[PDB]
Each structure stands twice: as structure tokens, then as C-alpha cells.
């Protein structure tokens, strides 16, 4: 694919629509999420596109290279580590990310996997504790969706 889309939904008020487009050797990720508390929220691709138990069955971050958790600009990062999205006072986050590790085809393809928006900011692997290097201490999964092929 060259284009994908994901609709985020959960058990609370958080919702959003994320679009993905292959451009050169990168993926451009755009869209918006609403109903979020003001501030930063971790935003990652989780391994499985399994929504049988809500966002919990999505598994851990997509990490085909068996690395520790980092920020998007780090060399030591999971392929699914896209950092944080920032919600304004009205709870709206505008997403505008360009990333070279995720892909819409081949081995790092995220089609069929799960996009998750988390309750807290992702510490990018610099939190000082053990959890920081697994999940960035991003907390719970507020909303998620399976990444599908778009027109």
C-alpha cells in the first residue's frame, strides 16, 4: 500500500482519525485526536491488530529489531515509537509526523497492526526506571484502532 488509515476509539471520550502516506523512504502521519487532556500523550504502533479485548490485546510496541524503547529520533527505539502528540486546552491534538522506520509495506509494515494513544506523556526512554525502557511510562491505552489500507 501507499496509503493507510486508522480510526481510534476506546471506552472513554477519546477518538481520532489518523492517515498514513508513503513518501520517498518515509511515512507521513497526519490527522487529529480529540477528547484528550491538555498536554503530551504517548503515540505508538503496537504489535497486533487484535481488538478482541479492546486496546489490551494489541500487545506491546511493534519491535521487530528487539531494541529497547526510545523516542522517534533515537537509534535505540522500537519501530512503533512515534513519540508524543500534544493536545491543546480544548483536548485536540493535530498529528503531523514524518518517520523513516515505520513502513506501509515489506518487513516493517504497520498495515494490520494497532495505533494507540496513551494517557500520559512518553518519557522517550529517559525516565530513569525500567518501565521507561519498555513503554516510556505512557500509561494506559485511551483509544486504538487497526491500521487498514485506504484509497
The residues that are catalytic are 44, 46, 61, 69, 78, 81, 118, 141
SS3 state at 108: coil
How far, rounded to the nearest angstrom, does the alpha carbon of residue 91 sit from its chain's CA centroid?
Answer: 18
Q: Is 78 annotated as a binding residue?
A: yes
Among 6, 35, 40, 44, binds Cu ion (CB under 5 A): 44
H or E segment to which residue 72 belongs: none
C-beta of 2 vs 149, nearer to Cu ion? 149
Sites for Zn ion among residues 9-68 (CB under 5 A)? 61
Backbone CA torsion sign across 10, 127, 87, 63: negative
From the list Zn ion, Cu ion, a copy of itself, none, pick the one residue 114 interacts with, judged by a Cβ distance below 5 to 8 Å according to partner type.
Answer: a copy of itself
Measured from the CB of residue 124, what is the shortest distance to a copy of itself in angstroms? Answer: 26
The answer to whether 95 touches 31, Cβ cutoff 8 Å, is yes
From the list Zn ion, Cu ion, a copy of itself, none, pick the one residue 81 interacts with, judged by a Cβ distance below 5 to 8 Å according to partner type.
Answer: Zn ion
- Kindly report the number of other CB atoms within 10 A of residue 108's CB atom: 17
Options 48-56, 76-84, 90-98, 109-117: segment touching Zn ion (CB under 5 A): 76-84
* 96 φ, ψ (degrees, to nearest 5): -150, 90
Among 10, 35, 42, 49, binds a copy of itself (CB under 8 A): 49
Alpha-carbon separation of residue 30 from 4, 19, 20 (angstroms): 11, 5, 7
Q: Establish if 5 lies at the interface with a copy of itself (CB under 8 A).
A: yes
Residues near a copy of itself, by CB under 8 A = 1, 4-5, 7, 17, 47-52, 59, 111-114, 145-151
Amino acid at each position: 500500500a501507499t496509503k493507510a488509515v486508522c480510526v481510534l476509539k476506546g471506552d472513554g471520550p477519546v477518538q481520532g482519525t489518523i492517515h498514513f502516506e508513503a513518501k520517498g523512504d518515509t511515512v507521513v502521519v497526519t490527522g487529529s485526536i480529540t477528547g484528550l487532556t491538555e498536554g503530551d500523550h504517548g503515540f505508538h504502533v503496537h504489535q497486533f491488530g487484535d481488538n478482541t479485548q479492546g486496546c489490551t490485546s494489541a500487545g506491546p510496541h511493534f519491535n521487530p529489531l528487539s531494541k529497547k524503547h526510545g523516542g522517534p529520533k533515537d537509534e535505540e527505539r522500537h519501530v512503533g515509537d512515534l513519540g508524543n502528540v500534544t493536545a491543546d486546552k480544548n483536548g485536540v491534538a493535530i498529528v503531523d509526523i514524518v518517520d523513516p522506520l515505520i513502513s506501509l509495506s515489506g518487513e516493517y509494515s504497520i498495515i494490520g497492526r494497532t495505533m494507540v494513544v496513551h494517557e500520559k506523556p512518553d518519557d522517550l526512554g529517559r525516565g530513569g526506571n525500567e518501565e521507561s525502557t519498555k513503554t516510556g511510562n505512557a500509561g494506559s491505552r485511551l483509544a486504538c484502532g487497526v491500521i487498514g489500507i485506504a484509497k
